[PDB]
Structures are given as structure tokens and as C-alpha cells.
Amino acid sequence: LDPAALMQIGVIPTNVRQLMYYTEASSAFIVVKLMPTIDSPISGCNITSISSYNATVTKLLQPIGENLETIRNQLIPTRRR
Amino acid sequence: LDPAALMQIGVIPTNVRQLMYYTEASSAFIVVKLMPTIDSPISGCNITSISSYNATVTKLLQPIGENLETIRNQLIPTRRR
Amino acid sequence: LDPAALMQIGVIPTNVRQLMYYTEASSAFIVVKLMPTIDSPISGCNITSISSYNATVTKLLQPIGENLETIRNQLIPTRRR
Amino acid sequence: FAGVVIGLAALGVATAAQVTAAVALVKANENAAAILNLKNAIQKTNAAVADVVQATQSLGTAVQAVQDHINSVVSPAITAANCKAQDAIIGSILNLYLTELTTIFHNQITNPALSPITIQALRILLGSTLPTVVEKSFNTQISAAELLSSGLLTGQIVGLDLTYMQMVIKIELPTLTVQPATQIIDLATISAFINNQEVMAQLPTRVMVTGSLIQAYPASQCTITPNTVYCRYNDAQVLSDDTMACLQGNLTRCTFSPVVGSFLTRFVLFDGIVYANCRSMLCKCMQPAAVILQPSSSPVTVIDMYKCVSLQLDNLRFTITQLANVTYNSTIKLESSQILSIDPLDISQNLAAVNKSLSDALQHLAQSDTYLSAI
Amino acid sequence: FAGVVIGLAALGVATAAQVTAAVALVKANENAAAILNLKNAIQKTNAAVADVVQATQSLGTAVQAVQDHINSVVSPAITAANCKAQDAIIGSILNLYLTELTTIFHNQITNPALSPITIQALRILLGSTLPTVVEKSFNTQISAAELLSSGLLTGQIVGLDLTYMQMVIKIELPTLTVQPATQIIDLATISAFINNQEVMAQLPTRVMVTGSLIQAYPASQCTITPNTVYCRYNDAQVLSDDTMACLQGNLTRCTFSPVVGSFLTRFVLFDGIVYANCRSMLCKCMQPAAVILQPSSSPVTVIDMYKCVSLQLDNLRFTITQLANVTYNSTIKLESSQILSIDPLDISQNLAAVNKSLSDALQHLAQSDTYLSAI
Amino acid sequence: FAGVVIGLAALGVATAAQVTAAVALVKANENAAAILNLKNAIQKTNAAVADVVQATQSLGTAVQAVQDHINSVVSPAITAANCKAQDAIIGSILNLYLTELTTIFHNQITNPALSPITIQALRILLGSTLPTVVEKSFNTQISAAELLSSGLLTGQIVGLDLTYMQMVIKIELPTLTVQPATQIIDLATISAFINNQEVMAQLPTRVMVTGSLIQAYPASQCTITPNTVYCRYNDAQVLSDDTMACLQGNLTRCTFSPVVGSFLTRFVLFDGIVYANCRSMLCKCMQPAAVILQPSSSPVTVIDMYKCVSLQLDNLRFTITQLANVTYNSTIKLESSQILSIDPLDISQNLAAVNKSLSDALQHLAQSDTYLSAI
Numbered sequence A, B, C: 001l002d003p004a005a006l007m008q009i010g011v012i013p014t015n016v017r018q019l020m021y022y023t024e025a026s027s028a029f030i031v032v033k034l035m036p037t038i039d040s041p042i043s044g045c046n047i048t049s050i051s052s053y054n055a056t057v058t059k060l061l062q063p064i065g066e067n068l069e070t071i072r073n074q075l076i077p078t079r080r081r
Numbered sequence D, E, F: 001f002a003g004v005v006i007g008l009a010a011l012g013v014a015t016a017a018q019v020t021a022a023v024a025l026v027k028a029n030e031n032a033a034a035i036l037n038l039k040n041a042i043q044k045t046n047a048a049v050a051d052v053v054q055a056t057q058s059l060g061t062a063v064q065a066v067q068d069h070i071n072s073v074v075s076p077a078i079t080a081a082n083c084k085a086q087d088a089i090i091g092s093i094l095n096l097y098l099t100e101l102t103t104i105f106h107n108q109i110t111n112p113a114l115s116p117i118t119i120q121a122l123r124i125l126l127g128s129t130l131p132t133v134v135e136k137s138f139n140t141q142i143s144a145a146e147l148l149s150s151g152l153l154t155g156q157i158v159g160l161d162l163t164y165m166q167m168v169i170k171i172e173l174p175t176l177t178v179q180p181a182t183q184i185i186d187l188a189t190i191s192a193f194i195n196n197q198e199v200m201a202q203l204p205t206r207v208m209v210t211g212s213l214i215q216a217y218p219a220s221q222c223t224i225t226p227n228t229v230y231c232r233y234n235d236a237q238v239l240s241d242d243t244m245a246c247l248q249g250n251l252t253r254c255t256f257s258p259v260v261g262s263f264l265t266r267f268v269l270f271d272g273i274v275y276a277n278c279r280s281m282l283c284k285c286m287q288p289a290a291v292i293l294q295p296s297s298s299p300v301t302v303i304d305m306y307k308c309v310s311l312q313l314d315n316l317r318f319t320i321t322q323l324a325n326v327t328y329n330s331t332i333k334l335e336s337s338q339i340l341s342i343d344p345l346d347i348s349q350n351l352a353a354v355n356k357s358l359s360d361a362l363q364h365l366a367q368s369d370t371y372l373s374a375i
């Protein structure tokens, strides 16, 4: 690259940066609870909200769930167990 | 389309899907209340935030309102049907 | 521009608008308090939230702060401006 | 509709889509009017979601996007004391909603009422009531989850009372039918090695195929499922004769551009077979032990079980337990003239060079009419 | 000299806008200093929006985006009873704001303090306070609803106290003046039927016109209303002589590309009359009853009252009305060489074919020079 | 051959990145299973963030995005009186979260479980818990502020229990190594005045340089800091020989396009030195008092302390105390053939005229073919 010649036609190097790549990754496991805990005692009341959310969320994750199981059932390590 | 030839030069058919179109729709009417209801009794004060919310939302929607009125007033379905 | 000719080949001018340009700017100053005030008296309790929010936000605004000081210090008006 | 409309002039200049929408607007006159006739009752009802009913008949659903929140923060009785705090919290709730409204109702065009209400706009408009609405307002087999997560639902504003601040909206759910003898096909490319260069084929990434007809069919706005593409508007593009020819198996009419290769773009798995560029990538077979070499007259390598049983590609190791069918020959003769760049800057540079060459072939002509007149 | 600035080299490499912003920032020293001088008073006040006064005179506005929400959930006293409960709810409010902050504050550049604060960034930063702030601190005739719902507002950071976590920001509302003798015109296309092909003209979709000058003007960041376009800056683009000539009515200089036609792109309404491709689409006249045929000499049909009084286009039925000043010789002769694709892959295929045609002429030139010079 | 995988046909058709993700998923088997093993304990805990512990050792973190909100607004006992009111707010809390969930989980592709969970998607998924998870789950030099505000974090779903509605996600923070002898350089253009036109050079805006190799390198899906670019992947692009030559200083191989100039694109500041197009813009020096003019052979003007110590550019007034490096190094002679448009419509027009000209050459070639043959 010839920055000096380029500037004579109005081309300006505005930033010069290093390139990074990775070799290893630090990992962490998360459990997403999609259903909140309700601790308060329920007496003579149907909270329709919880079941309607349950149903729709469950349906939404169906494809992901079916895919995990196919893979986990048919993609087998000859070394892992 | 000849997927066999194409794979010989690295062109991979990754998905094959059906094309859908529609001949009719099922509709439903929603009315959006832009102003919430305050059943709480008011004693000796002015909830000033309701009025300014009102004016601003009202000004925001004037062009749509003006446009609906224009169309509803001047676009007239002729007899029969 | 010749709309009469353009429409004969399917080119339709759908809008004709005026062009505005900026000349003078009305100004206004705002202070954003990033930290919220807690007027409730705290006793036998360490609200660890205030602290970690502080620390994280502070770090998020390091570069802005440093750029602000650099510029304030190096960029001096003769008699402004 | 059905029915002859008078006074389209009132629209000024309008697209076919806008005309269509306006006709639907007037068709909805009665429906909107009846709902808005109950504006008083609707406004008196404290509910985030409630049925709008007249004479044992549901006209639709009335929604209030912030009602539950307002209900859980509002004092049971506003007095002179809490008035400062009550107005504070109330004001914040409305203002946040107001801010969201201002992100979908900019007034920019001629007929703003005809603009479609997208699902993104519906989410903002209805807030947390949207799941409840979608679940109840439609008698369909298509799940709420599919309706809430795709672009299938659109709205149109069919009524507005400004005094009561109530907006009637018509939501449509399309009823969809497979187009016969038609497929939408996604094409990916791995790199190939052709005439000493690592390249990729230059082709549309999504096509519509029906009979011998092929068109480019990106479906950017469309709703896509693993098996099905629903488009409201057919957005096909014509392909050239060369692209047609290439896509139909005439590989000498294809176009390839040099690429900077990488691991992740050098192979694909295809139903248990690996298609790989084994020249630009090391294809190390573990059993039998070999390095698979790619003759330069094979642009890519087919690695099925005949070539390898246990394969290593850098850090991936897997068994190939599928056999590929001999739709060959792998030997393909392609010209270097098929290798070129389709970047506008590059095309323009290539055009400049062609123009220059022609410029002086014309000059060599005018000074050949000079030699031809002196003879 | 006004107030000559010293020390611009401290900006490193900067653009004109960054320099301009840098000047403005130091021009704002005293006001920012004056506001931040009151940081302690400001910090102690518990309010979502509060006036910043100095000796009875207001300097600005202190805003706190999560203030009301904190007030509404925080216990009147926090003890070891609460603690876990209070620290839970408080922490989730702060953390949510923090997640929002992290989406608008990411240093990637040399001078982060000079980046504009957009309305999007302003909504995030001010929360529910944004409508209140706009409604108060701008003695203008532009509505809050218009200010909130567009890109007229823009901010610049002019101060920052990290200990107090107070950010001073200068919001500017541009006062706008019409540019005389200038129009911005949006152009749509319907398909035309030319030399046996359904095609569309290829032109910019939005141009600026001043006298005899035309420029592409794709006002993309600009604020658009039905009558006016406001650009903070400029983005005009030069048009070629051919496009200029086309736009000025020399239709033989126009370029058309073949398209996959559809109902919604085959006609428009124009102040009560219809312009339609009546070849690619059935235009059915109901009164007087007749199919409207389109000669090949007419790329599109003008359906005014003289052609049809009552029209049917598929499911659309409406009447046509009189429009003054509508003229057309309607019989244009266009060349098939005007019909081509402007898609980069298609151009490069087209170029490659010309380059090849040329090579065959460069050859013929050589044969014809050895056929000569032998004589 | 530790550790081979069998059954890749299960994936159907899959990319290398997908295959890689599949293999990482089955490696995660044991870890995911051990976590889901505690789904009963995890579920009973009422906490927004909570530790997942197996025999005094931590496996991960359990997060609940809406838990603190829920804890705050529900009464300590649910009666028959409550029901309606409590069903309301709870429902409004869940439906909001549900609406967000539907924005990140659409069923579009073959292997949905292998799609990366982006930071935007993590934000939605974790809500206000995200900053707490980043603050505790990673032990690096990289601050939480940087982790939240960048695309560094990425996740993969490695487990799911639909009954308990629990999704296990593996979050990966890369460990970054500087790649040797490599720079990423950003390029901007100010206008230049060349052969009587205000133009700009047509070049990639971001390039990668290693040794004598130069490639285009938009770091589009990358994490960018003032000194550093991180790319998960590698999106380099091949530059033509002309663009290469031009970037290496053969300026007669550059390409310029006419532009509508403006003040803000006619100059930069480069460490105190002004590079300005002083033909298209008025360059007024205050000391020594002069209008700096730009001769034709100077496409732009370099203004350092030897030219002007105090400059006014319209309303900008500033001093110049620095000096430029004075490599000329030769004559800047640019042809007019370097000035052109790379806009596809324009190229199309150009190509058509070049092809029109070629046809003339071809016919004249067949004509000379005759006069010569007639001898």
C-alpha cells in the first residue's frame, strides 16, 4: 500500500488496525428457564395465563426440539460415550 | 434445472420448497384504545400527563384521520353489490 | 424534466416536493442522569446493584470521557468562536 | 368488491396496491362504523382485551396495550397527596407508549391511511395483548406461534375516532394454496478449482422453477418454512440466456469469480456425501489412509464411501456411510474466459480496456483505408 | 477571525464533519461547565424531568430515564428484611437500561465524542422523558409529534462527569428554509410492452430538478413529509447524459429491462385517469363495453374518459373522470437495443461477448493486413 | 480415531459451519445432560439468576428473564377475588416475553437447532439477567462493558426440555490472537479536481494488507475497536489488478467518478494538516492573507504550516502548526479515460455504445474485405 501517493488524489487512510483471530474459546453454560416460578399459594383460581403461555412457547420451540433429538439420536461419536 | 451438473462445479441445492399463494383471506376487526381507562376516583388534582399525551397522539394521527375521511367521503360504491 | 413523455413509457411521477435546507439551529441542553436517586433510607443492606451498574456504565463511557478531556484540553479557541 | 367505485380522483396519484387498499377501505365502512358506534362503551370498559359485542354478536376485539400496567400501579383513589407520584408514573407509561407510536406513524406520503400495518407495527400497537388477540380472533389450523413469528399477519386501518382515540384495524390471515408444478430452490456455492484458480460460480441464490422456466426468486419479504415459501407478491426476476443455460446443465456458459477461499466455504455435506474442493483444502482420508487429490480437470471432489470411509477435514472427523451415484464424468472442460469479476468497479475497468482496444482497432481501420486508396 | 481554534492535530485523522463537531464542542465549554457545576444539586433531586436553573435562569433540563419506575417499586425504607427483594427489582431495572446503553455506545473509532446522537439513540437514552423534553425545551411551531416521529432532532455530547455519571447533551432543531426553484420528484414505473417484451424503464426512483439540471437524489437519511424533503446534508448523484436526455423526454435514449409482470405493477391511477399496460393485462371497458387493445406503437395505454367511462381491471371496477392538460402523441418508436439488463452478472456476460466479438475483429484485421502488404 | 462421528446423513444438506455446530452439539451431550438432570431443582428455585450446582461444583447459571418483575407484582396469596387482576398482569408479563421470543425463533430452515444465538438474541432471551451472566460467567481481561456492547459473545443451543421449558445454551467467548504482519486499513475519499471535473476515486473502503498482498475486507459481521478488528470468520474479497496497482501507487490505474461535491467532502484533517480540494472549495488563508488556488496538475491541495499558518474554511477558522511529508514523488498525470461511472445503468449505457461502435467496425471490416478481394 502506498498511502502517500493515494493522498495526492484524495484517498485518505483514516484508520490502521490490527487483525485478530482466535485459537481457543472460553465457554459457559446457561439454563434459560422460560417459565417463571410463582411461589405465592393459589386458592380457588385458574391462572389461564400460565397454561396459554406454556402452550404457545412449547409450540414455538417444537422445531428446535425435534432437531436436537434427531441429531442427538443419530449423530453418534465413535469416541465420546 | 440440472442439479447433477451444477454440483460438479460446486453449486449445491440446499433446499427445495413449495410455492404458496392465496385465493382468499379470513379477517378480524380490532379496535385499539389509545387511551387507557382510569377507574380511580380523582380528588383535588389534575393528571396533566393525560392531556398532553392526548394532544400529541391526536396530532400524530391527524393525517391518517384526514385521509380516512377524504376517502370515505369521496370514494363511493355505485349501486348493485 | 418532461413528465408527459415519461408517462408514455410507464414512468409515473408519484410525488413532487420542495427541498428544504438548514440555516440556523435552535439549541437546547439536557443532562442525562445515568444513576437514579434512591431517597429511601438503607440500613443493614448493601444494594450491590447500584455498584455494579456504576462500574459497568463508567467503563462503557471511558472512551467518550477521555475523548472529551483530550479535546477540551488540546483544542483552544483564540477568542471563541 | 365487486361494486363500481366513483371518485378515484380523490386519491391523486396511487399505485395499484393503494387503489386496491382504498377499495377495501370503503368495503369496510359498515363494519368500522358499527364498532365505532360502541366507542362509548368500549372506552368505559377497563380491560386489556375485551369482546366488542352487539346484540349477542361479536364485531371484534377491543385492545388496550398499557391497561394492565396502568392497573397495577394506579392508586385506588387519586388524591391531593399522591397526585404528584400518580401523575409521574402514569405519565411515564403513556410517554413510553407514545414514543413507540411515533416510530410507526411518520407522516410522509399522500395516502397514509392506505399504508399496511406490518406485524412489527402490530407488536408495538397491541403490545402484550397481541398473543391474546391472535389466539382468539382467528379460527385456523396455523398455530399462534407461527402467526406471531412470521410475516403472515398484516393490518389495515379502516376506522379512526380521534375524540375517543380509537383506531379500528382489519387484520387479514391469508388462506394459502400450493402453486402446482413449481419449486423454490436455494443454491449455495462451495469454491471450485478451475484453470489454476480458486473460484465460485456466479448464480442467483434462490430460483423459482416451473417446467422449463427458471426465474430468480429472492423472497426477502416472504414467509419461509422448511418446506414452503409464501409470497404475497410475485417478485421474480428474469434470468439471462447464459444463466438459464448454466442452470440447465451447460457448464461452459457458467461464470466464476476468483474468491479468497476458507475452510468453511470449501465443502458441504450432502445427505452423507461430502462435496469438497480437495485442491484448496487438504482432504485427509483416515481409512483407507490417503490424501485425496483432485485432478485439475475436476473442479470439486465427490467424497463418497468409494473414495473414503473415515474422513478428516482439519478438526472434523466422520464416517462416510453413503454411496454417490455415478452422475459423471467428473472431467469438465471450462475456459478461462468464464473466469471474471462481476463487481461494478471491475466490470467498468474491463469495459475501459475493451473500449481502448476497440478505439485503436478503429484507428487501425481508418489508416487502412489510407493504404487501400493508395493502391 | 471569529475565534481561531488551536490544536486540531489532537483530532488525529478527522473528517470535515468531525472537525465541525469538534469546533462546536469547544464552543460549548461555558454552558456545559455551567450545567455540570450543578451536578450535586442535580444528583440529589429525585425527578424524571427537572429544570436546571442558575440564579433564576434556566440552563437546561435534567432527565432520568428510569426514575419513575424506581420510585414506584422501591420500598419507603430498605432494610435487611427487604434487601434481597429490593436489590433484585432495582438491579433488574438498572441492568435493563444498561443493556440498552450498550447498544448505542460502542467505541470503534478515533473520536467517539464527536459521533452524532441520533433520535433512535435519544429514545434509548431518555426513555419516557423524551416526549416531555421535546414538548418543553423547543419554542417552535413544529409539533412534538413531528419532532418525535422523524430525524429532525439530533444530539451532540458536550460534557460528561464520570463520578456523578452525568452526560450533558446539546440537542439542535434545524430551522428550515425552502431551496428556491428546486423540486424533488419521486418516479414509479409500471411495465410497458415494447418490441414484444414486457419491460420497465431503468431510471433513478427519486431526482432533484433545478432548471435544466437533474440529479439522482435518493434522500435516504432525509426527513420526508408529503410536501417537503429535508436533508441535513446532501447525497445527490451525477446522472449520465443518456439518463438526463431520457428524463428530458428523448425516449430513444431510455433503457428498459425485461420484467416478470404482475397485476400490481401494470397500472397506476393518476388524478382519476389510468395508465396501464393493456397488452400484458386485460383492460376491460364496461361503458362503452369493449376490450381495450393496445397497439405495439403504444408502450402503455392512457385510459381517460374518451377511451372508457367505466373500467374493469380484474376485480377492480371504477369510473374514469376528466383531466385537463393531458397530451400525448401516443405512438413512440423505440429500438430493441434499448432493451437490456443492468444486472452486474448480465452486464459481464454481455461484456464478455463483446470482448470475444472484438477479438474476432482484431484477428480479421491481422488477416487483412497480411492480405495487404503482400501486394 | 478420536473422536470420529457417525450418522452425518441425519443433517440432510448442511454447510461446513453447520456440520461443525453439529459436532460441537454432540460433544456437549454429557454437559447438557448433567444440567437438565437438575431441572427439577432449577425450576423450584425462585431467582432471576441462580447457580446450577452438582455435588458442590458449578455446571452453569440458571436465568429467568421476567422473574424479578413477576416477583414484584404478584400478591403473596392468590384468591378467587384476586384471580382476574393477577391473571391480567402475569399474562401481560408473559405475553410480552412471548412476543420477544417470537422475534428470534422462526421455523425457516432444515436444522434450526444449529443456528448461532447472537448477542441481540441473547439480550432478548436473558433480558435484565444478561449483564449479571456476563459479569460472572467469564474470567477474562475483557470488561463486561465491552462484552455487552460487541458481537464477541455468541451462543449455541445444546439442550432443551420442553416439559420443564428449559433451554441449555453454550456461550463462547473467543480468545483473540493478533495475526502477524497484517493491517486492516479504512479508506475515505475527499473530492479531487481532475481534467475539469470534481471527482472521487473509486476504491474499496476497507482493505487488508499483508506483505504485497491486498484484499478488500469489509469487516461487516465483525467486532471493531480503535486499534483492532476481530472477525469470527474471513470475508476478504479479491481485488482486480488495476485496483491493486492503483493502491500501490500507480495512479494512472485509478478510476474516478464525477460527484456532486459538498463542503463536508472537500477536505480532511490529517494530524493537523489539511488535505483539501481548493478548486471546488474556497481555501482562504488568513496569514499570509491569500486565497490558495489549486493548479490543474494538482488534484488536491496539501496545506501545512509552510503554506498557511491560519486557515479559514467557510466558517471554520483554525491554525496549522504541523508539516507534511513532501514526497511528490513525480508528475501526477491522469488521463480522462480514468473518469467514469461504475453505476450499473451507466456501465450498461457505455457497453451499448461500445457495442454499437464495434458493429460499425465489423461492417467496415466486411467492406474492406470486399475492396481488397476486388483486386
Ligand SMILES: *[C@@H]1O[C@H](CO)[C@@H](O)[C@H](O)[C@H]1NC(C)=O
Pocket (backbone or CB within 6 Å): A035, A054, F163, F164, F165
Ligand atoms: C407445561 O405444560 C405441560 C403440558 O401441559 C406440563 O406437563 C408441564 O409441566 C408444564 N411446564 C411448565 C413449567 O409449566
